Design an enzyme around this catalytic site. Sequence first.
Site, PDB file in Angstrom:
ATOM      1  CG  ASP A  84     -41.613  -4.792 -41.028  1.00 56.51           C
ATOM      2  OD1 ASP A  84     -42.493  -4.022 -40.594  1.00 56.51           O
ATOM      3  OD2 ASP A  84     -40.578  -5.071 -40.390  1.00 56.51           O
ATOM      4  CB  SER A  85     -42.938  -5.047 -48.114  1.00 60.39           C
ATOM      5  OG  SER A  85     -43.845  -6.083 -47.801  1.00 60.39           O
TER       6      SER A  85
END
Lengths: 144, 107, 118, 196, 62, 167, 112, 662, 99, 171, 97, 56
Positions: free
Chosen positions: D4-5
């Site tokens: 999720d980056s």
Amino acid sequence: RGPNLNIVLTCPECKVYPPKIVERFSEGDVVCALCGLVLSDKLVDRVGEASNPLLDGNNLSTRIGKGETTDMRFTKELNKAQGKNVMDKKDNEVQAAFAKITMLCDAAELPKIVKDCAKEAYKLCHDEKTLKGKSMESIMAASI
Amino acid sequence: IFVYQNNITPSAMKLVPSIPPATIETFNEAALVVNITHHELVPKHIRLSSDEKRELLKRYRLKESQLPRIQRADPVALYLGLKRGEVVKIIRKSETSGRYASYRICM
Amino acid sequence: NENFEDFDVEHFSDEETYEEKPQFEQIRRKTLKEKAIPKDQRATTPYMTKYERARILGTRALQISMNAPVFVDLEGETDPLRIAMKELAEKKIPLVIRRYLPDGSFEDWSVEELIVDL
Amino acid sequence: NQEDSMIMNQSSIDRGLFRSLFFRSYMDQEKKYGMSITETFEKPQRTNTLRMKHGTYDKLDDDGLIAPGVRVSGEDVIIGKTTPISPDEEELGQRTAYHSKRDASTPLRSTENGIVDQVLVTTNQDGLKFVKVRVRTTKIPQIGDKFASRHGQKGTIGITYRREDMPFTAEGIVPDLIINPHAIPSRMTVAHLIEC
Amino acid sequence: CPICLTKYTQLEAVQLLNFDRTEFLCSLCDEPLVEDDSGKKNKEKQDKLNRLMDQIQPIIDS
Amino acid sequence: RRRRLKKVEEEENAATLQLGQEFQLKQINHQGEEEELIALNLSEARLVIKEALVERRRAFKRSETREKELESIDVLLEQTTGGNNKDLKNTMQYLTNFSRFRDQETVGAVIQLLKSTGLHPFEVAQLGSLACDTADEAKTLIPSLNNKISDDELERILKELSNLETL
Amino acid sequence: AGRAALYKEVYNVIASDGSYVNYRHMALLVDVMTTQGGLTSVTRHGFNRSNTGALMRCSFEETVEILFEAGASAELDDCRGVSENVILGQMAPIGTGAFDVMIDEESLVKYM
Amino acid sequence: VGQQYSSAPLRTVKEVQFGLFSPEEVRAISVAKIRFPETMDETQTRAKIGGLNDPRLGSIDRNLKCQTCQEGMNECPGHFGHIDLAKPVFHVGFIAKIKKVCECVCMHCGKLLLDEHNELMRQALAIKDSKKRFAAIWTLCKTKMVCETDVPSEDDPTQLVSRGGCGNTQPTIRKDGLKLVGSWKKDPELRVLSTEEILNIFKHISVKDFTSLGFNEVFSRPEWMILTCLPVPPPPVRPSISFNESQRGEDDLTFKLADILKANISLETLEHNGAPHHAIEEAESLLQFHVATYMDNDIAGQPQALQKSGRPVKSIRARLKGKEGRIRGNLMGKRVDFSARTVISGDPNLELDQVGVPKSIAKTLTYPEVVTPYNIDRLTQLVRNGPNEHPGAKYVIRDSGDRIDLRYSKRAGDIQLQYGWKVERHIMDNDPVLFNRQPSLHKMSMMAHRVKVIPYSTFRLNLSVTSPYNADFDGDEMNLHVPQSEETRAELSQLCAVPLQIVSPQSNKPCMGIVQDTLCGIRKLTLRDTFIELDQVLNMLYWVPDWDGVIPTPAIIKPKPLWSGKQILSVAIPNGIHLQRFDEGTTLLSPKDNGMLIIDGQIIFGVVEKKTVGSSNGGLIHVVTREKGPQVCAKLFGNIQKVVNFWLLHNGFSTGIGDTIA
Amino acid sequence: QNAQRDAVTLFCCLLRSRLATRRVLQEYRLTKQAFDWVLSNIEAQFLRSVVHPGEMVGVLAAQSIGEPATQMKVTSGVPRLKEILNVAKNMKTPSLTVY
Amino acid sequence: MFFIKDLSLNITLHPSFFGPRMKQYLKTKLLEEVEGSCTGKFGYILCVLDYDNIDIQRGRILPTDGSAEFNVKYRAVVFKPFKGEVVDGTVVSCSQHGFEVQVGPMKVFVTKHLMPQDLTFNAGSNPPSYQSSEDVITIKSRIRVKIEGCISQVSSIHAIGSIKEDYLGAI
Amino acid sequence: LRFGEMERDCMIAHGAASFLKERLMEASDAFRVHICGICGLMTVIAKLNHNQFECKGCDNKIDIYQIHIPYAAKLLFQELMAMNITPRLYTDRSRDF
Amino acid sequence: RLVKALEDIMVHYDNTTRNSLGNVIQFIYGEDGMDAAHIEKQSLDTIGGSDAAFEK
Ligand SMILES: [Mg+2]
Ligand SMILES: [Zn+2]
Ligand SMILES: [Zn+2]
Ligand SMILES: [Zn+2]
Ligand SMILES: [Zn+2]
Ligand SMILES: [Zn+2]
């Protein structure tokens, strides 16, 4: 007359009076601006109720109301118990006069500043020797 | 040991307390059809003597109340006829150490 | 203020759920020397535990940070914790550990005699 | 960009990708608590005002309000308001007869900065003068700012690379943004791929 | 101490004695203490006691 | 043990032999056993402190008229005691200025005299401290002596203390 | 046998989804829950009723009522639990605090 | 500035004894008698003497000393006053206990209904603990309706022994709000029981009687349950807040004591000036209600005292119980200093036990370092750096406790540091800091890291440590805590460190493992097809920090030097590690290349997968941390992450819409 | 000593199963120094595997039980766990297993 | 007055003094703050006896500041006054409020309400003293005084003296 | 930042007692208060400059100890005093373990 | 709820498992006295297999 009970925030090293003092509110410190020595740390910058002791004086009264589980017989008993109280009779009538003044202001849509000025004008001139026999309607009208 | 059939009048329960050290235990026939000790969940209970209890308290530096308890109404406690202040050594199968020996005092 | 649909759980917050379901001696006595177990019959482990080693390192580093006399040769090391670990390495920490038994009795174990295997 | 980056193109950020304005409005009001217990929008002076904040007062004007267009920084006062106090007290040592007023001014946020966009002076329903100061700043996207697709694939920027470090096609096109493949299969977000 | 209006007995007057060994300085007011007018009314209390008791003797007899 | 709060107790006083909660006649030493409360007269205390100071001087070194003894104990306190010895110094000048016996022999004679009287160590230490000459003076000075000692025995103690007193 | 069945039920709940927990944790749970001879539930009326210190009990639930009962019964708290040392802000007798550090002199003077 | 030195011995609280104030104790400990319900003077500038804000109670203004202890905010604990009540009133938290005791004891002579002349009473006395014994006594004596002045003998029920007791009729007692009513039997006579009567009866209760009831003789007598001298809490308990430094808004507690004084003055005037009796019961009922809502505003079946805004009055019980109450909100857990909070980001280039601290956070959080000869130069340089430059210092604490801000002091010149001084310097690298993600269900979810100061605004941390934190970089905040002492720093580094807690005691398996891109790339790298050319091999070898500097011989020498992915990955694995695992269909020859075989830290066959470097028991992580130690396992985490991330960077991995198409 | 004997009897069973003479002399083929090394390492690792006194195993057990609850005919799961911990006389699916 | 006692003192030993030879440091730091120290629990402690052997226990390391805490049990001579006690002494200062008499290390005050009425103040005389028709009481003069009340703080002791009793005053 | 229940629980699980004590005292509120020895209450008037301690109502000037507690703990104990409850604090054991 | 139930239980130096009151919960921790982190799943060879395999 009376005790001093006054704390002065003076630098014990710079010895300059009056001292240049910076209040680091963010850092929780009170420091000398010259030498940088702290004076009082852990400074204090909601939970009660707002009450200005200038418009209604230092009256500290709480009434009785229905809670989550409230029996009505004790409710009326406590209401009439509070009703026969002797020391707040002047307090009771001055809040009655304040309520009537605010009702007059609200009935003729005056702004809140006029309500405040009329209330403080009545309070500052309540219980006057020269103002005792005049009709309370005239007192409120003059205050308005 | 008194084994009855269905029920006892409470007028007999009031005189079940008798002259010590004689003790009366009333056991129901229906409660005694199957030996609960033979159940696989019930571990081996071994009553301890007074010197054994004293040595157990001494070596673990315990007091009377600091032991795990078993009431004087437990079916195993009634099976052993336990009295107040009597400690049983409870040996049960351990899945981490094979054999685990616990102790419970009869309150 | 703020209006966030980003569901952040405000924490330590189980009293919403509490309000949802609210309805359902003889060897040792007093302060005698009998609490001090003699060295010959100490029944605790000779291995110094992780908490024991942590508190010895903390106490020794705190002392060294306040100019306690270091009892080992420094190799140019300046950090008090590494100096304390070096002192513990060759048993030069002059401390003893008072392991309290649950009955109030205690045993005294020196850091020198405690085996540091971890 | 793991788990999720994102890796957002720093060169794209330089050229205005996801750059945005941020306006905050500060409202302040002077009120009369009675006859003389009131306050006035004014620029306080160290000679006659008690308990000021340590921020600079130089950006204010004669009316105690900062002009629009002036850059502001952390804890700079933007609305100078003072009220009188009881004269001839003894508090904190630095109390004299000159200090007839205390400071009730409004500083900026300690972390916020920017430009004073628009200052608005008017009266309320009660006829009391009150001001509104709008401070405009820009939030250039940086590491940690949260970005989301149209499919519930939110996340923060992990790192920012310049164009010469990002991968590139045979046409020289670099991504503005790199997400991780691991966001796809667990969430089963196929419409993200179809939208792309 | 007339400023703080706080009473002091004989015991704690000694610890309020100054370096000059003459006066008793207050802790909070830093002012020399004055002597309370108690003890010279002991004869007044004796006269009050006797003037009460000659007026109560019929009650004693009853 | 002791279930403690503010109970009822009498205030400290001299005539009632109430020297406080921790000055009892029985005293527990550092070895744990009961031991008698020891109160010293001025001359006995002066000799005891002098022996303690010269013992401290000997420990440091290993590692008569009033004026010369006064300057001797002054230089002894200067060389032996460290900082904040002013109160001890004034105690030494008080002890030398108000002593009645100079050597350990007279002090031991007073001790063996007062050990057989059967009175409290407190009141016999007060008797050795004060240079009383009249039995009624001794009774009105130390009120614990009332209904405790016979007047003729009291006069014998005072006259023999006055005989033993020198300088 | 109730303790064994309770452990079996807890293990069934934990291993219902295939999650594995080491045996000693649920063993400790069921030993605490059966240490009084009865199924002492984890409730405000279960473990919270044993005489385990007023401050420990009031930290969990029914705080003011527990302090009222303690004041009425004049309960003495030995301050051996963790929670009492938390509220008093002193070193809890746990972990590093579960012992004391004495200073030695004989080995110290033996060093040099 | 700290606190003033105190000559009292510093001790720790070993025991806490509970009980009830005697009214004599209340009057003894009180420094003032509060008379006037007003707090402020008539001039509205000073504290009214005898009012609720009497200066003898304490002072809550900085420029005001306490009148009693002559100290300020930071030293005066506050001193208690008292209220001399006109009539005794009930403790609202003890209504049920008063009722139970009244059912236990006589209503005329104040004696227990059942004495030791009963077997049931004696076996009730055999109960040791106070609560169970009192419950048994109450259940036994609630059914007794007579004082029983004469009883039969215990040894034989033939002759009658005249015990104590008046033989009067004890009425049934029930509560109707805040008062107790007693219904005498009809040969029912129902009347309200006055509190003073109950107080007199409780005074007539002998020591052994309430000792059997569980009441301790000097700490909690049942007579002290009735309130007749209400202690006044000091203004530190009930401070006067300010909204804009012009209002004097007082606490609800002060409002309630004002109501208490009003009701008490009304009651004493009514009894003094003569009144009908119903006026007296009305006034004392109002006083009792005010006492109760002061003590507990939430009473079942009772109205609530309300503020001027109409909100209920926050009583002391409300301040005690609840989430934001004293215990759970301010004592059992609390807000702390030396903490930081920001969003988190992944960093493959950070070590496992290493955290990336923002520079501004590092410029804010400080660690007080004691001055030694070993760090005099470094601390002097940090002092000369100032607080505006990292690394630097913000405060210098002298040995006397005086603290010098390093701002506002350079113009006074530099400061010579002395040994034993404390320097509050910024946190540099390798500072042990606690690093916590709420909700933090388990101990692995908050652990100790090492600081690496980084120039951005995120807590940066290794990817493999995100699993025990249950952390994802979708905007998660995650807390930081800095110890301020060498003891806690040391025990944080030696107990709460990341490598020491690789293996979870939860399920006796590692809680951390190779995850996400590193896991996918370590599967792709150890395939049999994967061969790495010299130019990439040298870079991969140099990416391992503890690489011994020898290039391994290629798996293929001719016609081209090629290293397999297993060959390069085995460089990260330390020597002496032997792992063997057989999957289904796995032999010593692996046609599927499934299972594992590692010999002396060299991969023999098998693709590295979740069963190998994941958080699994018997995997590489577990074996290495059990045979080599935690530090070697953390270095292994870093090495594998670095080399696999580099190879995946130069290899690339994607997913697309075509991958979901059959 | 009886408790110490009972506490290691499962590990003693494992050790005797592994370190049999047939298995050592046939499969493991250990030398004198290899066998002494094995025994020394087994003793050292066993003494390192003992639980450290002072460890809060209650909080550790509570966390190790409560956390997998967060990770989640006859009833099962969180309601069953609540029925277990809050020891209720009734439950959703009271059942037997008769053999 | 003069007693001997067996006292236990708790001493904060700083970690800077953790040298090889802490025994004489501990004895020394016992010996500054005991000699001449005033405690209301036991009076003015003057000299410590039995210096060669003093009971030193194994010291407590405090878990916050690292200092060693020793419970040293020692034997010493003390000067604990009481009320109702008559003692000899010399006057060291005088005023209209009264005069201070030095009894050992203690300055006992005799208040102006506690002499017999014959004595009166004369500030004209140098030094200002109390003069009567039968005797004069000046500075450094022998006088016998009885103590009627002593107040003992945690570190200070003050006493109330008088010479109204017979066979008091100058000898 | 809230160092709440569950952070405290995890510190307990680590056994980090002194760090927990630091968080609860030196990081939030370290308040030093004096208590009487006779009564366990904090009703001690402390003139630190004059070095005079006394608990009026117990009339002792020689039996005073100082303790370090959280300020919230002191306010707790004062509130319990307002509840007519005694939080009597004692610096020594009276019952054997 | 579980943490507050078990917050005072510690392994003491006699290797017993007691609460704050000193009441013994387990006389040896986990019935074996082993730290949970130092536990691995291992196979017991004797219990499995046949009697012929046992002898062989
Ligand atoms: Mg998230
Ligand atoms: Zn300065
Ligand atoms: Zn004064
Ligand atoms: Zn105060
Ligand atoms: Zn009766
Ligand atoms: Zn007291």
